mmCIF file of N, CA and C in Angstrom:
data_model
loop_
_atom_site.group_PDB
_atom_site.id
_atom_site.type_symbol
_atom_site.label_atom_id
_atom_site.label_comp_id
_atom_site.label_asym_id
_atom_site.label_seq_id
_atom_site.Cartn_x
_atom_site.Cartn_y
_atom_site.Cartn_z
ATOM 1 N N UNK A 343 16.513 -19.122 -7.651
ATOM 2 C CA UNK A 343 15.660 -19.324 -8.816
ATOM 3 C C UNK A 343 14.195 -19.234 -8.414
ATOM 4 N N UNK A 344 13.814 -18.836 -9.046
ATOM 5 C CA UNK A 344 12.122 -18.444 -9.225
ATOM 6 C C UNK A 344 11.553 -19.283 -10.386
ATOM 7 N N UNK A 345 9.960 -19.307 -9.789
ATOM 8 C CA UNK A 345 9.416 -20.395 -11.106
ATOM 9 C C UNK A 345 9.056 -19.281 -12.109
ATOM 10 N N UNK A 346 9.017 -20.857 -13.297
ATOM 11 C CA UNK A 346 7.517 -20.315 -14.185
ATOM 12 C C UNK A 346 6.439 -19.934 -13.979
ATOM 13 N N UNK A 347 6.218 -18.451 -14.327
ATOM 14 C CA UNK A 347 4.852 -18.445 -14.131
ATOM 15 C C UNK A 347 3.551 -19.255 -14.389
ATOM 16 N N UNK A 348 3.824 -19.747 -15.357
ATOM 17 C CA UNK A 348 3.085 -21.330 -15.841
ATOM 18 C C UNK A 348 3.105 -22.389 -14.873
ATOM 19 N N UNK A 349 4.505 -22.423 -14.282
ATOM 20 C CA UNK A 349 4.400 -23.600 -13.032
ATOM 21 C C UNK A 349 4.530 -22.510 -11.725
ATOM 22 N N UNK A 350 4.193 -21.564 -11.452
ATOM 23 C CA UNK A 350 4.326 -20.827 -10.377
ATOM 24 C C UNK A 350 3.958 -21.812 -8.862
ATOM 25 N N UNK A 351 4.864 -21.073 -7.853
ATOM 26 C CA UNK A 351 5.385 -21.869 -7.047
ATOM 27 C C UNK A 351 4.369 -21.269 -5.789
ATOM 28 N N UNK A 352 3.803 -22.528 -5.020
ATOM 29 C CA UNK A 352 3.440 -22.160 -3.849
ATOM 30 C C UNK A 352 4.016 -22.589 -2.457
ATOM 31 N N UNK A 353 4.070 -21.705 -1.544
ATOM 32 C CA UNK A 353 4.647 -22.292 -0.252
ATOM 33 C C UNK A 353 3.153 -21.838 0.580
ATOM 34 N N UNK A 354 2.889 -23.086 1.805
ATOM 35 C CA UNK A 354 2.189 -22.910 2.882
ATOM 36 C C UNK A 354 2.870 -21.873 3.911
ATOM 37 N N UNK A 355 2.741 -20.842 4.403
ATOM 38 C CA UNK A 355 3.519 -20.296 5.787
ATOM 39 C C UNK A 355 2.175 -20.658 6.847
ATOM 40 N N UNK A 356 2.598 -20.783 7.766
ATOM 41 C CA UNK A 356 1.575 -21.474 9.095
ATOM 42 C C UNK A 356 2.857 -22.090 9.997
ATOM 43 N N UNK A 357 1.593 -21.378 11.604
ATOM 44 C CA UNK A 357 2.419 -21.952 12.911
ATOM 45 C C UNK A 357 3.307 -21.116 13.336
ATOM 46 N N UNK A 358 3.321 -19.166 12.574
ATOM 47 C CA UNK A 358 4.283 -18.901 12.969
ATOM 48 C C UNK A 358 4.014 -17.378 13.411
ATOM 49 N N UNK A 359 4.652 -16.306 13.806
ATOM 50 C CA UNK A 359 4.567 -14.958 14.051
ATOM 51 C C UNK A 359 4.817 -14.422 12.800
ATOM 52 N N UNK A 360 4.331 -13.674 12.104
ATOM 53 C CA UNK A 360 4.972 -12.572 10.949
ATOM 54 C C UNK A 360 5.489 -10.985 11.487
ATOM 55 N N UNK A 361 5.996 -10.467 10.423
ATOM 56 C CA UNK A 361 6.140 -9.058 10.683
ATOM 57 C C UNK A 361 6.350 -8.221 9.111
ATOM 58 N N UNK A 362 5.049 -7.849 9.053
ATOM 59 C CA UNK A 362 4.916 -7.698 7.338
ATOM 60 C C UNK A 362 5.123 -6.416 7.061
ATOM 61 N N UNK A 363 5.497 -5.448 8.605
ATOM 62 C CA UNK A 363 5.985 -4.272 8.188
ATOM 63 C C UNK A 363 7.592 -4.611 7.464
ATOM 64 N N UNK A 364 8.397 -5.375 7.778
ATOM 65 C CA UNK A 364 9.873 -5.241 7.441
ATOM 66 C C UNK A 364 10.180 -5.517 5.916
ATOM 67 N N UNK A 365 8.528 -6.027 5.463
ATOM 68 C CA UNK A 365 8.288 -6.165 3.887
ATOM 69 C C UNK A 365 7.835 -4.516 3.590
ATOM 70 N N UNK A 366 7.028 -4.111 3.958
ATOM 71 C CA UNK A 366 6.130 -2.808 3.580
ATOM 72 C C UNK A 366 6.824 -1.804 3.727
ATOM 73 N N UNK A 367 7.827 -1.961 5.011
ATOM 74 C CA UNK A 367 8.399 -0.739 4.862
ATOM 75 C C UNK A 367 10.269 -0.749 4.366
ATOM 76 N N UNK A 368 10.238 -1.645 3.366
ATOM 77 C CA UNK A 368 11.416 -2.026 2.266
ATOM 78 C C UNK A 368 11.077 -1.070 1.181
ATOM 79 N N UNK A 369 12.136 -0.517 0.833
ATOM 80 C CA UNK A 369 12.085 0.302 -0.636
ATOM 81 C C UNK A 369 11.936 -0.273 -1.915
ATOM 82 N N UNK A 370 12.641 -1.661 -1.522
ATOM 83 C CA UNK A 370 13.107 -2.431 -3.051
ATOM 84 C C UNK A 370 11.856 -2.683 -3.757
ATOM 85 N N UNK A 371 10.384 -3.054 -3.478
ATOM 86 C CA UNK A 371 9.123 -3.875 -3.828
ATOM 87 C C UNK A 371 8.885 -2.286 -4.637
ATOM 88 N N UNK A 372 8.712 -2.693 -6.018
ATOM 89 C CA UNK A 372 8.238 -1.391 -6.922
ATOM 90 C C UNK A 372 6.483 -1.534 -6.832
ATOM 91 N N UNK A 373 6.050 -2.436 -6.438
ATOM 92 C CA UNK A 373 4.299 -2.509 -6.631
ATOM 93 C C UNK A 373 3.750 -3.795 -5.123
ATOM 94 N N UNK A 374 3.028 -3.092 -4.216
ATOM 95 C CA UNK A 374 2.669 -3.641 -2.675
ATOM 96 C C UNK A 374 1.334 -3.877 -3.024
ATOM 97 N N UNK A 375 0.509 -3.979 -4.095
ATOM 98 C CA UNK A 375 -1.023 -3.508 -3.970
ATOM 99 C C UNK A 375 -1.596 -4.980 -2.770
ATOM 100 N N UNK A 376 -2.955 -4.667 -2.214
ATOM 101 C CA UNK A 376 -3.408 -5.450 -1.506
ATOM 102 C C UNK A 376 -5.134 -5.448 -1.589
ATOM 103 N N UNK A 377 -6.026 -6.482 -1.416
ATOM 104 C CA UNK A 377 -7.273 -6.458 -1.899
ATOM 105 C C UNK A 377 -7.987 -7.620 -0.670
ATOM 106 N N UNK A 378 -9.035 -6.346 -0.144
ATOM 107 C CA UNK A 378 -9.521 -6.733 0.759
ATOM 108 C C UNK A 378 -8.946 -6.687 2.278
ATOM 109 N N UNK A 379 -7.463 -6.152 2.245
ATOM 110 C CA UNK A 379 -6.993 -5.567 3.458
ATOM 111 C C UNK A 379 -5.662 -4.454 2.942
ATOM 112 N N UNK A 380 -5.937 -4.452 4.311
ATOM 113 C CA UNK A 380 -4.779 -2.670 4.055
ATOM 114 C C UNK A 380 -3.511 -2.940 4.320
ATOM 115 N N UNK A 381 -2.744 -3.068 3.713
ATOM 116 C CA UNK A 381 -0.951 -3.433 3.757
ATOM 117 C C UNK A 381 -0.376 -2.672 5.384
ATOM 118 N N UNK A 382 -0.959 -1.657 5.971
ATOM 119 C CA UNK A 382 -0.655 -1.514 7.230
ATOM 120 C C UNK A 382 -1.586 -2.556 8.480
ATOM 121 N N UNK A 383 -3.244 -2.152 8.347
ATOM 122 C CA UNK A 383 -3.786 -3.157 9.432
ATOM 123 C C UNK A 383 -3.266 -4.597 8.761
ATOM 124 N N UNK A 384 -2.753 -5.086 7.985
ATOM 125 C CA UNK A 384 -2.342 -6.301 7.461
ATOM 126 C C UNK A 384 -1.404 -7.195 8.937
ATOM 127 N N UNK A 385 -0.385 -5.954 9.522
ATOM 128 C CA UNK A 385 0.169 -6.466 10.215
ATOM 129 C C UNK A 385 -0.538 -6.163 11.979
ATOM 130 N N UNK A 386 -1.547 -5.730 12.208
ATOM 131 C CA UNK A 386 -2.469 -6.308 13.070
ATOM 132 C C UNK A 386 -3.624 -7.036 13.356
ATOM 133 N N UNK A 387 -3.740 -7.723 11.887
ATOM 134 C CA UNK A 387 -4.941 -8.880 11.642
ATOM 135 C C UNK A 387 -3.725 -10.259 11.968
ATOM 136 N N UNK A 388 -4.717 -11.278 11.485
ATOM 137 C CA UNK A 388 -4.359 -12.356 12.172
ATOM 138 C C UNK A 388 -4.935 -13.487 11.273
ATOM 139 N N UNK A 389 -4.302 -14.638 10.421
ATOM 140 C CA UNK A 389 -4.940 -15.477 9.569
ATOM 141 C C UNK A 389 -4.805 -17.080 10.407
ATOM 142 N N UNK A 390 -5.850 -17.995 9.345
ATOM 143 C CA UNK A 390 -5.367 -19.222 10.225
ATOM 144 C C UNK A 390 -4.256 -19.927 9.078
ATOM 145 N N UNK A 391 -3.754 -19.271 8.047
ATOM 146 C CA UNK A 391 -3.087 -20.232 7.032
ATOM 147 C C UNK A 391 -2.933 -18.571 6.227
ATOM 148 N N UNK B 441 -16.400 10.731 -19.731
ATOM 149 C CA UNK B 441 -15.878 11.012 -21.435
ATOM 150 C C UNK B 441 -15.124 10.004 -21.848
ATOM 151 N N UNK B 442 -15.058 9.784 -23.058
ATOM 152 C CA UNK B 442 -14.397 8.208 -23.677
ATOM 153 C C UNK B 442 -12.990 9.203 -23.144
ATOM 154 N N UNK B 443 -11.977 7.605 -22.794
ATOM 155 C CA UNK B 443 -10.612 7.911 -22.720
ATOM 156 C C UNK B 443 -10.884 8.578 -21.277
ATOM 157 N N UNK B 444 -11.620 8.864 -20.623
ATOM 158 C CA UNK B 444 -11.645 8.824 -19.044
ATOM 159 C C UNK B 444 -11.978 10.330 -18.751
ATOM 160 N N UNK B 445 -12.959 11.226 -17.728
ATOM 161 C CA UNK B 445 -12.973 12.369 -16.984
ATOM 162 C C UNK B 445 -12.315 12.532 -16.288
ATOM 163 N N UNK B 446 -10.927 12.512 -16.440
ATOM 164 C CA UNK B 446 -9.862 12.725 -15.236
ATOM 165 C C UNK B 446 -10.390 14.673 -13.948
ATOM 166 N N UNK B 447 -10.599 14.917 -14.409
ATOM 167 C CA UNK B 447 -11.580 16.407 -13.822
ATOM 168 C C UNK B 447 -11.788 15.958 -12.511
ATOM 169 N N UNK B 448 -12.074 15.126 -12.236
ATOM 170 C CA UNK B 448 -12.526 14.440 -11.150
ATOM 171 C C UNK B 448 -11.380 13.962 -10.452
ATOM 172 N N UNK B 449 -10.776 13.569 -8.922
ATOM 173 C CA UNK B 449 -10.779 13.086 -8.087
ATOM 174 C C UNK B 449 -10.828 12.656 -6.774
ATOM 175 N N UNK B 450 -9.923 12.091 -5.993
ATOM 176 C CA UNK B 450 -9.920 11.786 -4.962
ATOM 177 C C UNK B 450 -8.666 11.051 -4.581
ATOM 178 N N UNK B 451 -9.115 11.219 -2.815
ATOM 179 C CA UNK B 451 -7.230 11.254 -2.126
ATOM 180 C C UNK B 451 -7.656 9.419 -2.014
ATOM 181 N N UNK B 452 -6.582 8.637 -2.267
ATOM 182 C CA UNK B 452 -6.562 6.713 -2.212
ATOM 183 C C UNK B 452 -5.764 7.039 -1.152
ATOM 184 N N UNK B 453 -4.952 7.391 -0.543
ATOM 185 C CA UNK B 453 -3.856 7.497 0.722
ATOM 186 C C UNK B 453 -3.766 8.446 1.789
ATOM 187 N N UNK B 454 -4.232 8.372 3.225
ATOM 188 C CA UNK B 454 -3.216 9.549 4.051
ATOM 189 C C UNK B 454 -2.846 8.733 5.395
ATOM 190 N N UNK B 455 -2.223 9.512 5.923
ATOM 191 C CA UNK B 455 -1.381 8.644 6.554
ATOM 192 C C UNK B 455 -2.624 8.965 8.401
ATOM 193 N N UNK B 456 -3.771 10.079 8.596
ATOM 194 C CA UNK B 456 -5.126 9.218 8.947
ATOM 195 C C UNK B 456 -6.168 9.958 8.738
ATOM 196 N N UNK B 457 -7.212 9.103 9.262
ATOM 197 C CA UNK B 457 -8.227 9.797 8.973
ATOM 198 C C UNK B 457 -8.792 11.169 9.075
ATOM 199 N N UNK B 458 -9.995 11.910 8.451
ATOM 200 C CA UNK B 458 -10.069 12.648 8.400
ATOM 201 C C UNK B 458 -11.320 13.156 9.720
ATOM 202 N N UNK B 459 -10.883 14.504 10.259
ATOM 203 C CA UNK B 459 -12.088 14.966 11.453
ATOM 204 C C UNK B 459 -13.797 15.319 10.851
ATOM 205 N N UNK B 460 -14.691 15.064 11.405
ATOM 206 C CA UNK B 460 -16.060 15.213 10.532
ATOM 207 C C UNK B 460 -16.109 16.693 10.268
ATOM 208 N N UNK B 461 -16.073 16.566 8.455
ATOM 209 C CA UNK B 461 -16.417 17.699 8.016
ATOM 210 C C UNK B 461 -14.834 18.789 7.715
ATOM 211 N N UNK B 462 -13.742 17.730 7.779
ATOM 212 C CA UNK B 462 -12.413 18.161 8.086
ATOM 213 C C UNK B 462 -12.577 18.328 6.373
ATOM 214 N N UNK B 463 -11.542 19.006 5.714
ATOM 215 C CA UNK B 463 -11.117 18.953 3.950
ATOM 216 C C UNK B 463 -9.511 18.994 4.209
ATOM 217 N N UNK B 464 -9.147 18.248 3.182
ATOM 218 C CA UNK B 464 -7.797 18.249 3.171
ATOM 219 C C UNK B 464 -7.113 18.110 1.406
ATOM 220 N N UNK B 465 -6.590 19.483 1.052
ATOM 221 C CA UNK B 465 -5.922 19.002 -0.543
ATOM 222 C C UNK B 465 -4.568 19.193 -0.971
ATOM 223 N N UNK B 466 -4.219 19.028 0.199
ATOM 224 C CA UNK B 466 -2.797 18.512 0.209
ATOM 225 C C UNK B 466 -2.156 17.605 -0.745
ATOM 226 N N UNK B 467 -1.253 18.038 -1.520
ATOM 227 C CA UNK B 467 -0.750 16.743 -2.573
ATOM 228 C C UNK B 467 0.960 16.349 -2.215
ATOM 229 N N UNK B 468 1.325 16.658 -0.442
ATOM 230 C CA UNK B 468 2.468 16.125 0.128
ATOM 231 C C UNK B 468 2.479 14.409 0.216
ATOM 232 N N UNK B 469 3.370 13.686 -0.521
ATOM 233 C CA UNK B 469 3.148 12.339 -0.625
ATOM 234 C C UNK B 469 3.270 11.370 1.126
ATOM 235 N N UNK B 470 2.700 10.846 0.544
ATOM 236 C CA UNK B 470 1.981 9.767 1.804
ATOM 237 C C UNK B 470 3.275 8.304 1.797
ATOM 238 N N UNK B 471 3.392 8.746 3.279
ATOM 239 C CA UNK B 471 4.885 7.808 3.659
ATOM 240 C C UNK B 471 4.394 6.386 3.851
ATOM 241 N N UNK B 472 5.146 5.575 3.450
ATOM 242 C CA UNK B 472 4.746 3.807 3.715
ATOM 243 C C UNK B 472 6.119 3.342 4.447
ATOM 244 N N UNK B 473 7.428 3.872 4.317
ATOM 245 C CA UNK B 473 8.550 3.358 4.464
ATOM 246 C C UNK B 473 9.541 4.480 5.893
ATOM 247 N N UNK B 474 10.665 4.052 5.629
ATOM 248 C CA UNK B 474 11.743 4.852 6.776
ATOM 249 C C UNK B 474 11.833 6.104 6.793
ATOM 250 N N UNK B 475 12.146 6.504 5.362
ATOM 251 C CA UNK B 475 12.709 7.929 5.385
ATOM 252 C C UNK B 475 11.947 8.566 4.574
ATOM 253 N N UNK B 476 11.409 10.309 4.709
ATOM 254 C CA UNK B 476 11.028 11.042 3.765
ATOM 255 C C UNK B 476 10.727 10.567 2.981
ATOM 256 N N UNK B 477 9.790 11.311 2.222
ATOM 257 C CA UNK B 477 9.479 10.601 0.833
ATOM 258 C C UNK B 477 10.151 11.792 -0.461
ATOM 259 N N UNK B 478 10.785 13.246 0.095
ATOM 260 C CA UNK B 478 11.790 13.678 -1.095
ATOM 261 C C UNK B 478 11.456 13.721 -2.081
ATOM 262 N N UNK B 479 9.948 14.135 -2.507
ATOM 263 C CA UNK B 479 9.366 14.542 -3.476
ATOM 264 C C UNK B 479 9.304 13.420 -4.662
ATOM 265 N N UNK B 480 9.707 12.164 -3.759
ATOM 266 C CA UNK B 480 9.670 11.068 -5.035
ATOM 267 C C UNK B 480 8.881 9.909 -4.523
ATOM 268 N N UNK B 481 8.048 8.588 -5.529
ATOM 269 C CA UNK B 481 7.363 7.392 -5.131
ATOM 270 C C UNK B 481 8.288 6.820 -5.029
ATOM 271 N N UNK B 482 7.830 5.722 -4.444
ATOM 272 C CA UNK B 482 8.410 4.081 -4.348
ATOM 273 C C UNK B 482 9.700 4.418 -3.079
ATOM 274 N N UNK B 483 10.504 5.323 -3.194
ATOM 275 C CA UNK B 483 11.731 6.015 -1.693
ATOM 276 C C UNK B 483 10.335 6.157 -1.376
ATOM 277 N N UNK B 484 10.076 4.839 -0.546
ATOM 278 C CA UNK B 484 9.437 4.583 1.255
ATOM 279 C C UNK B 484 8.100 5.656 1.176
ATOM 280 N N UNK B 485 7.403 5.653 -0.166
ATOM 281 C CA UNK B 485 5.999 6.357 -0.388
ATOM 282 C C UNK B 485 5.644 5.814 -1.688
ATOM 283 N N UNK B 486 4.035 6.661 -1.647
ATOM 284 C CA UNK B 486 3.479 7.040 -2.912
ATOM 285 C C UNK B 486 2.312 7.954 -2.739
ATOM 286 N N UNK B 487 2.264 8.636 -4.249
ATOM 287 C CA UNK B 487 1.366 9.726 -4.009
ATOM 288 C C UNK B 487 -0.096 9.818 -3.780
ATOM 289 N N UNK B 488 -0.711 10.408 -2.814
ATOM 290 C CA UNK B 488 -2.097 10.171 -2.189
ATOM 291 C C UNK B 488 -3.519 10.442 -3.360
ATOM 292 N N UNK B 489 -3.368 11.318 -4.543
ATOM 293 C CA UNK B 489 -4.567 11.417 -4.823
ATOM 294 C C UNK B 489 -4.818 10.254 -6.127
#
């Protein structure tokens, strides 16, 4: 289950390694847009949260 | 022009950059995913201009 958009749901991720190609390069996501970084350097930047 | 100058554009995608003074008008779609992109979006692309 997924929220309401009215009560839309947040999770913290932190403390961990990602790998945001195995998202990007999935067929299923009909719309990836990204603002202020590039969905490829995405997965060689680095956040604190 | 009201309702937009489409006459005009430009490439949003290639897969890299361009050499100084390079032109490129290629309208072969720009891969994000595994396989070919097979003349179609969203199958692991979308189109560059």
């Amino acid at each position: 289950r997924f929220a309401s958009v009215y009560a839309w749901n947040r999770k913290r991720i932190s403390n961990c390694v990602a790998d945001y190609s195995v998202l990007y390069n999935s067929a299923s996501f009909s719309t990836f847009k990204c603002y202020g970084v590039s969905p490829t350097k995405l997965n060689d930047l680095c956040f604190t949260n | 022009k009201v309702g937009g100058n489409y006459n005009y554009l430009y490439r949003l995608f290639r897969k890299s950059n361009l050499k100084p003074f390079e032109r490129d008008i290629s309208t072969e779609i720009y891969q994000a995913g595994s396989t070919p992109c097979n003349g179609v979006e969203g199958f692991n692309c979308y189109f560059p201009l």
